[PDB]
Amino acid sequence: NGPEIMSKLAGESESNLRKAFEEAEKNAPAIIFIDELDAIAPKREKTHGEVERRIVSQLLTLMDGLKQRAHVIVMAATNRPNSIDPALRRFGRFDREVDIGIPDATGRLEILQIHTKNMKLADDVDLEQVANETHGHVGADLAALCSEAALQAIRKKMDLIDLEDETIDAEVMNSLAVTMDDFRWALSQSNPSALRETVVEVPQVTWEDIGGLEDVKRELQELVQYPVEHPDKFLKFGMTPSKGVLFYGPPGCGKTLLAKAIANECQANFISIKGPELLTMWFGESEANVREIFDKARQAAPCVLFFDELDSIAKARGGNIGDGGGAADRVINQILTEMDGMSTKKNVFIIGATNRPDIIDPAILRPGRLDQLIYIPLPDEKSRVAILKANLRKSPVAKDVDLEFLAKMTNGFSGADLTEICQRACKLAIRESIESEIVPEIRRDHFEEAMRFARRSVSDNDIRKYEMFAQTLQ
Amino acid sequence: NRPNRLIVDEAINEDNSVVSLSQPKMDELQLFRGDTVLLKGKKRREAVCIVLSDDTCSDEKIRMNRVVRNNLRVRLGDVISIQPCPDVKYGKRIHVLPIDDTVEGITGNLFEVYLKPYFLEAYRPIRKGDIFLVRGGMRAVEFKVVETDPSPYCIVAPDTVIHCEGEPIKREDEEESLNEVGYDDIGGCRKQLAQIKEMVELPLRHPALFKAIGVKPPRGILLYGPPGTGKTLIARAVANETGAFFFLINGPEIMSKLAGESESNLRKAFEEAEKNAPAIIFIDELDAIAPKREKTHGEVERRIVSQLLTLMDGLKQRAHVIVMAATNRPNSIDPALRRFGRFDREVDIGIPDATGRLEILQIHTKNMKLADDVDLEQVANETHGHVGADLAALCSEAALQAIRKKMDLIDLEDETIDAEVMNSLAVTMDDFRWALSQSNPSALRETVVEVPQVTWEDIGGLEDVKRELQELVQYPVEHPDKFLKFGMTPSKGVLFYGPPGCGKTLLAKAIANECQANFISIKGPELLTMWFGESEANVREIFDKARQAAPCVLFFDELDSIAKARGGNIGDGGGAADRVINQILTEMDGMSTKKNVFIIGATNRPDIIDPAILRPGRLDQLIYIPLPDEKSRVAILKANLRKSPVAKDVDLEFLAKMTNGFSGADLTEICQRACKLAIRESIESEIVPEIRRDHFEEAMRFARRSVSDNDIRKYEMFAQTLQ
Ligand SMILES: Nc1ncnc2c1ncn2[C@@H]1O[C@H](COP(=O)(O)OP(=O)(O)O)[C@@H](O)[C@H]1O
């Protein structure tokens, strides 16, 4: 480990290092694990001194020194890849590069179940919702959660009597159990003190979650599915599958849901770049970050890379009058660059979404880019029924309140305006239930009080404007 | 389970040898507040103490101070046996006698002072061998009772002849001396004091269990806060009180040595401490060793930041050692020190608040014997900005002032300066107000985090808003599974909008108080600073500080400030988005699921706010805060005047009548304008001293309303337009 090697004096260092392999090549097949490779090998501008630069050397030439008569494999742990000296990646040193990544909800379950196999828990805690609120936790955060859970429960009991003897009794800890009120107390601590950076996981949204948009659901499958499944068919007509899509339409109509739904149907990774993140690069004048975004999609492939609010920087410049310049700007420029310069097909599929297709720069549109415009309209009462149901397919809704009549009264709302009504109703309910008793389910009159506040955010003006962009483009 | 034994726990009172039982135990032990009780302790020794009756304590925990515990040899969390002794029998002059080094430069007659005041009005029961401690004249000297004419124990009576001796029997080797800091020496940081004791209770107190169990106890703890906030103090108290061996590294000592003489002391510091386990290694000034960064130059500095990383790794949990390290800001140190298995726990000691600066002040004068008028409440009110060391410096400068006005007035200076003379010495309020007049807030001022003192009692009107806000902030924290029954996420934002001075700030502070939550206020100038300074990386440090202060209310006041600085009636050519609000969006939506951080924005220009703030997952609930009504304008006038005296002669609802509308701030203007015309009268006099109706009439001559009825209609408009 790097700091041990860095702990020694000059020449006592690289001796342990060149001994570490000359010791291990005996015992072969063997694995040398160099974790904290940044400690040894950040050979860069930033190192000062010869002795640091000496040790980044000689590591390069112990990598070269293994002739394949060495059965040794060298693993090295790093945190971000740009961390280390680029000559460590020369072919014949570290050729393979494998990203362990943050675990997801579905994975944070297995970790939790590994770190309590010795505990003998209590019956109500299900580890599914424990694994749901632990988002942001790496697997060590998880190990720390459950150990703090088990040190809490040992605080509420046992030494209650002060039974402390030489060797503390066997049968007594087995009686000891850790309830859900321990774990929820374990999360209440600071524990997401670990990193939060761009997440990459398979979303949990299946098409079951999207009311309506039937034609879009089948259009998207062709775009994303058929190429990956049936390539030589594309090779029979000498065709390149289009790797972009641009969803456009009013807000809250499900442009995000569709992107996640299709990553799920493919069981592909979904990286979401939202509007604030593009604005960050544009104010911060750091669009070198766009490269790190696509290389992270490339390493997470097959993946869906989703740019939401791709008009964000165009808005921040205005765009009804706006600045004197043209449509091009720093960040979208690097998205163009990294798109068209990407690998032939790595199964990275690029989805943009915009609520202002008007002010997007047209260069994004040209073939080899987001090449397929897909309009995402305000739902119809046909769909407004399935929107109301897909929201209420979790919370309990009594039969007494009926749907297609609610979905009737709205000439148009977004699918988001409808969730507004739903969630507004569910708030009026919990308000009732918390109070009681001094009955505990939803009711029709909850929704009627909700509908008092139902507003539509789309003004029938701009639907005609949206209707216009549709026929104008072809 | 043979309910004889009972646990020992901390106690509020200042006096010695008083244990405070849980009231639903009365007839179990059968003994009332007039019976003294024998308590069993380690190395076959005991004590007997009169008993007090209180509600708040747990049933199983005796509450008693340090002195009564040390002789018992009980450390908090240990269990003692409590058995009554109605059989008590008075003594005739138990023999008492000075000990330690404490026993410093004293001389002459210490018995009319360090005994006779204390024994008086008391009947303090005393068993032979007790260390019971007395304080006077800027010193705490304790007198051990070596001999009791009857035995084992005795009440003291005013009728026992008193024995003048004053000889210095040195303290025995095995007892750990009292002068050493315990938990009661730590005034104002206590929420986190439970936190550190919770972390370290089980590892330090119970070495056997973690050898008898699979699990990992905390390896290292990082105390951080501005310098002088008591971080060394905490580590020593925890060590001294659990009994564990406390080792102290400080960075500049390690940095003082030559290369290789350095890391040897360092790797010896643990290889020395792992013997003495359970032990605490305190590495304060961890920035001196471990700022491993770009900024270090040299191998030897980078060597020492290494090897510290790998002494952290080297403890295998057969080490019972806990490593505490003090730091000032967390970004200060090398990030590989925070790898899990090195410093996993991170605990922020923080600036004390008015309510805390009181306890600190009361700890640093326990030996002084003050003067009657100084109340330490307003002393603790104007000491804002002072860390706990600033406070220790205040009161010591107060006591060196009062020693300057007196004593050496005669020049009585002898070999050993007299005992009875300093006890007469007292420090009045005119010393402390002179102590504050100095530079002493030479310590840090950065963003404060404390529970505000504004209760709803302070806000005139806004009844519907008061109940709306409670639902938003309270119901989620109290009743989560109810939110889980309908699969709902509690909205974590609010945006107050309305005219100025209508109480948008007060409401935010009032609700943090009703929750008893921390309140961080980011005001308008601070957002403008980030926008001119083009440093919006600071917004991250703002939310991570809320996250560490959670449960907290984070309040953005004047969230339109950057929009104004760009204009906004015509304004720049750009859109609504800008650098700083962008990072607020980012840090909001990317925040932890629910840490009980509740985000309140306030604006007097909801017009020019960017709409992206509004979208669900952000400040999602708009709450309009209107100009008050004469209904409320009465309670506004009263909540201002609920401090200063207002004679009945001046009447309110008629003042609150004449104003079609003012802000709640315009009304405070009138109030304060009146109170100025009054003090003007009182300072002058006499060459009467209270407010009067005509004061307020002269005030009302200058009453202006800052809201012009135009924009109320504009405010009325934003209200119905949004829904
Ligand atoms: N067609 C729809 N079907 C089901 N839910 C929807 C639909 N449209 C919107 N919603 C709900 O509204 C929310 C916001 O929609 P979003 O995916 O952001 O759409 P957009 O990107 O077009 O604004 C989503 O969480 C979703 O649950």
Ligand SMILES: Nc1ncnc2c1ncn2[C@@H]1O[C@H](COP(=O)(O)OP(=O)(O)O)[C@@H](O)[C@H]1O
């Ligand atoms: N919360 C507190 N309660 C009582 N005394 C305090 C408190 N904080 C600081 N002090 C006083 O301040 C002095 C400096 O404390 P120290 O722990 O050395 O500072 P730091 O926190 O920088 O390590 C100590 O002598 C202590 O008496």
Ligand SMILES: Nc1ncnc2c1ncn2[C@@H]1O[C@H](COP(=O)(O)OP(=O)(O)O)[C@@H](O)[C@H]1O
């Ligand atoms: N409704 C009110 N009730 C009591 N005091 C008020 C009220 N409104 C304003 N004040 C007084 O006016 C001052 C300024 O109000 P502030 O909280 O800044 O409101 P805003 O943020 O809306 O300007 C506060 O110190 C408060 O004491």
